[PDB]
Amino acid sequence: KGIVLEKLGIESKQPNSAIRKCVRVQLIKNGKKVTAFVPNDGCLNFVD
Amino acid sequence: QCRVCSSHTGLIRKYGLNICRQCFREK
Amino acid sequence: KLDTSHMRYLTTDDFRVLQAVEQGSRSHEVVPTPLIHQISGMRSQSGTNRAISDLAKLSLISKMRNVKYDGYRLTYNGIDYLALKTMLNRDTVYSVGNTIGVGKESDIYKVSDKNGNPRVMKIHRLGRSNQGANWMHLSRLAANKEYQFMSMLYSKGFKVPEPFDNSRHIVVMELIEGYPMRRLRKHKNIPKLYSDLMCFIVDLANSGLIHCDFNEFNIMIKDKLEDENDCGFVVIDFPQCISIQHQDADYYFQRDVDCIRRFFKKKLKYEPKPDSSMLDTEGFGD
RNA sequence: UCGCAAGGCUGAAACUUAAAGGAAUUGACGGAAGGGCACCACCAGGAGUGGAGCCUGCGGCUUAAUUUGACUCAACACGGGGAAACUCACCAGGUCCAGACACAAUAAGGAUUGACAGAUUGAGAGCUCUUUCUUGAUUUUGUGGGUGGUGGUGCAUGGCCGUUC
């Protein structure tokens, strides 16, 4: 588990064609920055 | 025409035979 | 015949594509299916076969379903619409049409520029159209070669109109409000302009290209100035141009002496005054 | 490590991939052309265009109207359309006429019917029954299922012959 850094910038390693509502996150056990994902996608409203 | 087409161009009222100018080489 | 009204349904989806595929159909004639995306870097399935089925009816591309060598071809509008699109891309044509004029491989299409003064989109389609292996190869390059051979006396002090762009079949020639020698009625200085027909081929031998082809449609007393009628010469005499090395100048040189003798005499019953000139001077004074 | 050197010997990971590789084969397209054999093409020239007035036929201007489209599939037939109002696919203005089937208001004191007499006219008409009187039970209407598919474009299904072979 880790904090969400921010909204994510899409760099094409193919193919799902949208800004995928993904989350730049950085963990707290380590602090090593990983791009993440949510399924059931959309609903970009309900956490900071 | 004779009922095996939807023929709308080059229509015929002449002489009751219903065979087109484009249909002397088909019909 | 002609279609024009199959173009304005598109988006950016074909604008990155064109001169990548136009330089890509030349590098690699008939293009198969999954390459329109990947010549232009367009993405695989974000508005793609929607846009290619949009292009499909428009006759600038066609679905040539051959056996695993498929065809997407940039029919005859793959040059024609897409050179209209190219002049939209090369900043000359902003919309299509105020156009009147008919030839075979030169249609006069009267347009207004980026400036606002008019010019003419002449279009090249020979064989009518017959556009095939060399016919497309001609109208691509005879738009390019005759972009190079309409300046042979403009630099040298004489009157040849100037070409502007050579997009795929299109040659843009100001526009010339001519008056050919079948339209005119009278003249104010007759005997100057008969001996200047010996003397124009004198001028043509300076540049090394003798032109002959003079019918009654040729020499336009044009409109440079409208009000005071400072006219000029447009000399539609070009395509009988012959390299003088070839063995036909025995009857090209003698045309310069005794073949123009009818038109200022008969058309303009008035038997003429002036002298003449040969081209024996122009053999040395190039 | 070995060599004066150039290099020689031993040899990874970070990352990225749905592939890289082996031999083997079937037939489109040629920028291969043969012969045909075609005078709907070529040589010898005829008829003659190519310069013009018009029938006949369109793309263009102009429209309430200067209609229209595919088959031998295109530069063509004008679709027997050379044309009169009709033709003739469009136009300048009007109305004969929509509620049946159930029950609900009036239903035979006139709901709504007709062999007729007028007003009749909108740009020129038949139609109506308020102002003779057939009416004959029946049918008038704010309504919805939709019986009304005299909306079939059809989706193919069943032979049958234009078409494709």
UniProtKB/Swiss-Prot annotation, chain A:
There is a cross-link at K7 (Glycyl lysine isopeptide (Lys-Gly) (interchain with G-Cter in ubiquitin)). It is found in: Cytoplasm. The modification 3,4-dihydroxyproline is found at P15. Changing P15A: Lethal mutation. Hydroxylation at Pro-15 affects translation termination efficiency. The stereochemistry of the 3,4-dihydroxyproline has not yet been determined. Component of the ribosome, a large ribonucleoprotein complex responsible for the synthesis of proteins in the cell. The small ribosomal subunit (SSU) binds messenger RNAs (mRNAs) and translates the encoded message by selecting cognate aminoacyl-transfer RNA (tRNA) molecules. The large subunit (LSU) contains the ribosomal catalytic site termed the peptidyl transferase center (PTC), which catalyzes the formation of peptide bonds, thereby polymerizing the amino acids delivered by tRNAs into a polypeptide chain. Present with 10600 molecules/cell in log phase SD medium. Component of the small ribosomal subunit (SSU). Mature yeast ribosomes consist of a small (40S) and a large (60S) subunit. The 40S small subunit contains 1 molecule of ribosomal RNA (18S rRNA) and 33 different proteins (encoded by 57 genes). The large 60S subunit contains 3 rRNA molecules (25S, 5.8S and 5S rRNA) and 46 different proteins (encoded by 81 genes). Belongs to the universal ribosomal protein uS12 family. This is Small ribosomal subunit protein uS12A.
From Swiss-Prot, chain B:
Belongs to the universal ribosomal protein uS14 family. Zn(2+) binds at C2, C5, C20, C23. It is found in: Cytoplasm. The modification Phosphoserine is found at S6. Signal peptide: none annotated. Component of the ribosome, a large ribonucleoprotein complex responsible for the synthesis of proteins in the cell. The small ribosomal subunit (SSU) binds messenger RNAs (mRNAs) and translates the encoded message by selecting cognate aminoacyl-transfer RNA (tRNA) molecules. The large subunit (LSU) contains the ribosomal catalytic site termed the peptidyl transferase center (PTC), which catalyzes the formation of peptide bonds, thereby polymerizing the amino acids delivered by tRNAs into a polypeptide chain. It comes from the Eukaryota. Component of the small ribosomal subunit (SSU). Mature yeast ribosomes consist of a small (40S) and a large (60S) subunit. The 40S small subunit contains 1 molecule of ribosomal RNA (18S rRNA) and 33 different proteins (encoded by 57 genes). The large 60S subunit contains 3 rRNA molecules (25S, 5.8S and 5S rRNA) and 46 different proteins (encoded by 81 genes). Present with 6490 molecules/cell in log phase SD medium. There are 2 genes for uS14 in yeast. The gene is RPS29A. This is Small ribosomal subunit protein uS14A.
Curated annotation (Swiss-Prot), chain C:
Autophosphorylated. GO terms for molecular function: ATP binding; metal ion binding; protein kinase activity; protein serine kinase activity; protein serine/threonine kinase activity. Changing Y194H: In RIO2-1; nuclear export of ribosomal 40S subunits impaired. ATP binds at K122. It catalyses: L-seryl-[protein] + ATP = O-phospho-L-seryl-[protein] + ADP + H(+); L-threonyl-[protein] + ATP = O-phospho-L-threonyl-[protein] + ADP + H(+). It is found in: Cytoplasm; Nucleus. Keywords: ATP-binding, Cytoplasm, Kinase, Magnesium, Metal-binding, Nucleotide-binding, Nucleus, Phosphoprotein, Ribosome biogenesis, Serine/threonine-protein kinase, Transferase. Changing I170V: In RIO2-1; nuclear export of ribosomal 40S subunits impaired. Changing Y72H: In RIO2-1; nuclear export of ribosomal 40S subunits impaired. Its cofactor is Mg(2+). The active site is at D213. Component of a late pre-40S ribosomal particle, composed of the 40S ribosomal proteins and the non-ribosomal factors DIM1, DIM2, ENP1, HRR25, LTV1, NOB1, RIO2 and TSR1. This is Serine/threonine-protein kinase RIO2. It comes from Saccharomyces cerevisiae (strain ATCC 204508 / S288c). The lineage of its organism: Eukaryota, Fungi, Dikarya, Ascomycota, Saccharomycotina.
